Amino acid sequence: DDPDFVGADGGGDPEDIERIRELGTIKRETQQRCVTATDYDTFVSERFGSI
Amino acid sequence: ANTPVNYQLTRTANAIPEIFVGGTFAEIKQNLIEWLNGQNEFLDYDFEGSRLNVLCDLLAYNTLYIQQFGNAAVYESFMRTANLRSSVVQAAQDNGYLPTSKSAAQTEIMLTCTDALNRNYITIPRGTRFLAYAKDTSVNPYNFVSREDVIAIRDKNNQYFPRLKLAQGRIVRTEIIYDKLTPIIIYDKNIDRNQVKLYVDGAEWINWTRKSMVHAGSTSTIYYMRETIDGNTEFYFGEGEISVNASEGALTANYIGGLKPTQNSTIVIEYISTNGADANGAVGFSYADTLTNITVININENPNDDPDFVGADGGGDPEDIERIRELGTIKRETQQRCVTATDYDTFVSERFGSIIQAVQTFTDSTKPGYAFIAAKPKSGLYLTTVQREDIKNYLKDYNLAPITPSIISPNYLFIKTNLKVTYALNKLQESEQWLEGQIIDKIDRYYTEDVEIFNSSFAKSKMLTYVDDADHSVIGSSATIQMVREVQNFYKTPEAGIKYNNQIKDRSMESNTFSFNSGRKVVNPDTGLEEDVLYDVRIVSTDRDSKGIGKVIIGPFASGDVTENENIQPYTGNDFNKLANSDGRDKYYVIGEINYPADVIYWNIAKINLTSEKFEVQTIELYSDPTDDVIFTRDGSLIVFENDLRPQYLTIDLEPIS
Amino acid sequence: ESFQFSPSYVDVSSISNFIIGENEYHEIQGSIQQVCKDINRVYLMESEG
16 A cells, blocks of 8 residues: 555445536547547546656 | 339438327317227217217317427427427537527728837737728728737837737626526627637636637636527536546545635626627728827728728628538537538538538548638638638647648639519509619529529529519519639639530630730820830630530730741631720630530640730639520539629619509 | 555565566477487487576
């Protein structure tokens, strides 16, 4: 471990019927593909922005 | 021939589950009257006995009363079956595409103004308003306001022009304290969501949605629109995990949705309501708001001239259900970022949808890396170069990186027509002249009704129907078309030449007369030196030749104008048509050639060795008469109606009859 | 990759479960000559070198 801990993680309503609207309002916008330019680096720097 | 079939296609053009279809009451009863019949409880009761009949008759009345509720909702329930428009937007809005409110008349100005203070830099603060009379009417100017701040270097000689672009209306800004439970309405009509910008306390947030939307701003800044069914716009923003989710870039994580508010983040928004779609073509401007120490010495219309342009832009209805209805499906189909050619069609259709009646997205296989676009300014045929640049860059936001947007107005077939239309004087008390003002509307009506839509085959007569339909006191109507193209280089044909897509009569291929500078000298008493002589010529087709070909005959030439070459001779053929000149100059050369079946038309003035510059004008209009009734279009070549900018292409003779 | 280490473990082997690392293989080498008169006669030995 690291010296940061709680016994367990996970849970959730899950839904929060309002809160999910956004999420639905969002993912309809999402792409698994990468296109343009700044789509990439985002998705890219999601990997090893540590580097 | 035609279409053979195996049980093919599906369910007409579009779904009608059709259990829903409203039927005729009697049939409804006729159906239902059977229903009660055969009912086990009674096989005895005769329904055509009028007693039960009217009783059952009533059940259907409610049953029909109730059905159109149940049925219409379905039309409503399903986009593209939705009959209500404010419906249509909802699913469209839901699909990630909204239609917008009338979109402010927009333009740019450069204005040379001396600062009285002679400071190095003045800004024009966002919100200075200018006035523009609508075209030909000075009774009122249309106010329009500085879109944004702009500053200008003081030139030496102390006078310097800033330039800035202008959308029409008044800046209208309203602060609101945000609160948890409440709608945030703007009841303002004439609002347009594209000119809506706002401030939370301090910084601006953008509805992601067609403002920027790719920047480091992390999406925490954001909000939405929506259309109240009332017709006024309400504000919205995402609440709680306003960014994608959870920890994301922050090491502290926890939760931020923003806008608690308590009183936090008092929301101040700033917008322009507009009179637009009425303001298009507003040329004369005023400098309608003073500033400290700045004095406009001149405001000069239209930098970087098209040269053919009109005042402002934009406006919009806003609404059309037809263009909107299917359309958002493509945006429902496509992601935000525009990828497919028609995705570039529909995407462009979003912003400047009120600028563009029709936009043609295509590749030109020659140049990769370029998105080739053919659009309709819908006020005119030519988007002013700034618009082109404008939407481009904005479009360019959504695009593949190596790809570049490239917008060109395609060539345009012009229908040049004299109209002969008869009416009975007595039959109309109404002012004769205004009748012409009537028909001249109903002419484009057909176009807008038809021609720009598909850019398919064009029916002259069918056009003449609606203009026939105008006054009904019009006794008769006649017209004659001259198919007209415009040419960019008189000097050299475009490589491929030019094709009509449409069969023309031989020898009926004409062009415009235009002067030609001839090196030979002219002098007249009191005139003095007088440069040299210049006379005019025009492009002439010879007759049809066997194999449907013709050679392009140049306009008449005086002797010694063209150095005679052993190769090039005066064509001096019998057939070729000739203008009548005072010169009587009979020298005619073949500058090129055509064939009528292919409709393809080529020449080069390099052939005659005559210098390009000894011609005054770079572009010439093209005359031809298609032998065929109806005009066929293929690609980028579209007949269209612009009378105002080009009236000489549209003429109408009016025949008064008793 | 995968497994976190952290102040964790005494065990050598649980880590050996995968150190990453690399494993065994065989390879065939060369032809043979008889010391005398038949190869079936001769026999082989290879110390590691």
